[PDB]
């Protein structure tokens, strides 16, 4: 824990730094160091559990991924996600969509080592308003919006879970299955064109994410800043 000791003394030192800086500002007669503004670092660590997003993987600036969360290329984290990796890590592969209004959560500390990880293996769509708490979703997966995947669930290999539906603990959805309702019960089978459509939607959102990020890197529009400082 020598690392944690270094971290703690780093906090002490930097805190003294902030305090002496503020003394300097009060001396200089400038109280600008009170302009309350939300920190909201889109990527955040706890001690050494920093996230790791691959380059060329769009993460919306309004997202919130903190804790041990790792995500690979061609991925998209669309506005309004909560990717938590505090206790057990989150791993997310290539070519994946975690749409706006979604959290990939990890159960708050249960007594034993019952805190399962969460794996989201590439070519997976996870639509809007999706809560995935401790699950194993695999390649060619569709999680259609309004979705709840409680701890202990395994969906795999071109499998779809419809909409507005929750899957209880310890449930498995293998190839060619759709489940729905409260609780999630099996409805029917899939179609090969629907599976190719899964893949095409994955690719289309990869391109959408490229566009959105290239637009989000557009130099911050100083004009509005000087406007808001004017009045």
């Amino acid at each position: 824990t020598l690392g944690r000791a270094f971290y703690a003394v780093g906090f002490w030192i930097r805190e003294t730094g902030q305090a002496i800086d503020r003394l300097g500002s009060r001396l200089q007669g400038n109280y600008l160091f009170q302009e309350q503004l939300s920190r909201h670092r889109p990527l955040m660590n706890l001690f050494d559990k920093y996230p790791s997003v691959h380059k060329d993987a769009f993460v919306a600036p309004s997202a919130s991924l903190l804790g041990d969360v790792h995500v690979g290329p061609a991925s998209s984290i669309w506005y309004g996600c909560v990717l938590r990796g505090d206790v057990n890590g989150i791993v997310i592969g290539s070519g994946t969509n975690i749409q706006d209004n979604s959290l990939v959560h990890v159960a708050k500390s249960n007594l034993t080592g019952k805190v399962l990880p969460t794996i989201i293996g590439d070519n997976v769509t996870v639509g809007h308003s999706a809560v995935l708490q401790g699950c194993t979703v695999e390649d060619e997966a569709f999680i259609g919006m309004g979705a709840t995947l409680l701890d202990g669930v395994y969906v795999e290999k071109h499998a779809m879970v419809a909409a507005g539906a929750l899957v209880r603990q310890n449930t498995r959805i293998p190839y060619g299955e759709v489940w729905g309702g409260n609780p999630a019960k099996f409805l029917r089978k899939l179609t090969e064109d629907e599976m190719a459509f899964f893949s095409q939607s994955a690719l289309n959102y990869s391109n959408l994410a490229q566009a959105h990020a290239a637009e989000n890197a557009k130099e911050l529009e100083e004009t509005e800043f000087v406007k808001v400082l004017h009045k």
């Binding site: 906090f11 002490w12 030192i13 805190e15 003294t16 305090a19």
Partner: protein
């Protein structure tokens, strides 16, 4: 060793005063050094003053010896 006991005392008292009000232990990590300094100087001066007052008390007792010597 006196100054070390004083410094540890000051640091402990400062952590205490930071723990009573529920804010974390090392809230102002630049007060703790002032606490250590004050504790050190306090304990050192306390030892000095105890030595001095023992000397004065022994002188007073020696003078009280004469007040009872004439008594016999």
């Amino acid at each position: 060793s006196a100054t070390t006991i004083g410094a540890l005392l000051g640091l402990g008292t400062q952590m205490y005063s930071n723990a009573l009000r529920k804010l974390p232990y090392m809230r102002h990590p630049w007060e703790h050094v002032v606490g250590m300094g004050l504790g050190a100087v306090f304990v050192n001066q306390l030892l000095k003053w105890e030595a001095q007052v023992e000397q004065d008390l022994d002188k007073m007792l020696e003078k009280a010896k004469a007040a009872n010597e004439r008594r016999y």
